Amino acid sequence: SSNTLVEMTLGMKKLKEEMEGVVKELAENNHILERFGSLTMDGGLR
Amino acid sequence: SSDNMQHAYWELKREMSNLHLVTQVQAELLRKLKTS
């Protein structure tokens, strides 16, 4: 189904790139937590 | 061709593994944070 299949290929390419972006941002979040994070009984949204 | 679809698929699966990993790193990190 070559017209629907070309879009499947490009679709999978785009999903990969988006996933890459999410991984990068999650790693940046992890870096913030690694340096500055803590868990406290009365932490959270204040 | 049909091959390039297989390659895009492989790369997508490969990136999913990276997503699983960064999520598991985050889980571990939460376990290791200071508490008070």
Residue numbers in the entry:
A (entry chain B): 679 to 724
B (entry chain A): 215 to 250
Which passages does the manuscript contain on this structure?
OPTN is an ubiquitin-binding autophagy receptor, which is initially found to participate in the xenophagy and aggrephagy processes, and more recently is also demonstrated to involve in the PARKIN-dependent mitophagy. The N-terminal coiled-coil region of OPTN is responsible for its interaction with TANK-binding kinase 1 (TBK1), which is a noncanonical IκB kinase family member involved in innate immunity and autophagy. Here we biochemically and structurally characterize the interaction between OPTN and TBK1, and demonstrate that the direct association of OPTN N-terminal coiled-coil domain (NTD) with TBK1 CTD domain is responsible for the OPTN/TBK1 complex formation. The structures of OPTN NTD in complex with TBK1 CTD and the related NAP1/TBK1 complex solved in this study not only elucidate the detailed molecular mechanism underlying the OPTN and TBK1 interaction but also uncover a general interaction mode governing TBK1's binding to all of its currently identified binding adaptor proteins.
Analytical gel filtration chromatography and ITC-based assays revealed that NAP1 TBD can directly interact with the TBK1 CTD with a binding affinity KD value of ∼0.72 μM, which is roughly fourfold stronger than that of the OPTN/TBK1 complex. To further uncover the detailed interaction mode between TBK1 and NAP1, we also determined the high-resolution crystal structure of the NAP1 TBD/TBK1 CTD complex. As expected, the NAP1 TBD/TBK1 CTD complex structure consists of two NAP1 TBD and two TBK1 CTD molecules, which pack together to form a symmetrical hetero-tetramer. The hetero-tetrameric NAP1 TBD/TBK1 CTD complex mainly adopts a parallel and compact four-helix bundle architecture, which is capped by a short anti-parallel β-sheet formed by the C-terminal ends of two TBK1 CTD molecules. The overall structure of NAP1 TBD/TBK1 CTD complex is very similar to the four-helix bundle core region of OPTN/TBK1 complex. However, in contrast to its continuous helical structure in the OPTN/TBK1 complex, the C-terminal region (residues 715–717) of TBK1 CTD in the NAP1/TBK1 complex adopts a short β-strand, which directly augments with the β-strand of the counterpart CTD molecule in an anti-parallel manner. In addition, unlike the dimeric OPTN coiled-coil domains in the OPTN/TBK1 complex, there is no dimerization site between two NAP1 helices in the NAP1/TBK1 complex. Further detailed structure analysis showed that the interior of the NAP1/TBK1 complex is stabilized by nine layers of interacting amino-acid side chains that are mainly mediated by hydrophobic contacts and polar interactions. In particular, the hydrophobic side chain of NAP1 L247 buries in a hydrophobic pocket formed by the side chains of L711 and L717 residues from TBK1 to assemble the unique hydrophobic ninth layer, which is further stabilized by a pair of backbone hydrogen bonds formed between two S716 residues located in the anti-parallel β-sheet of TBK1.
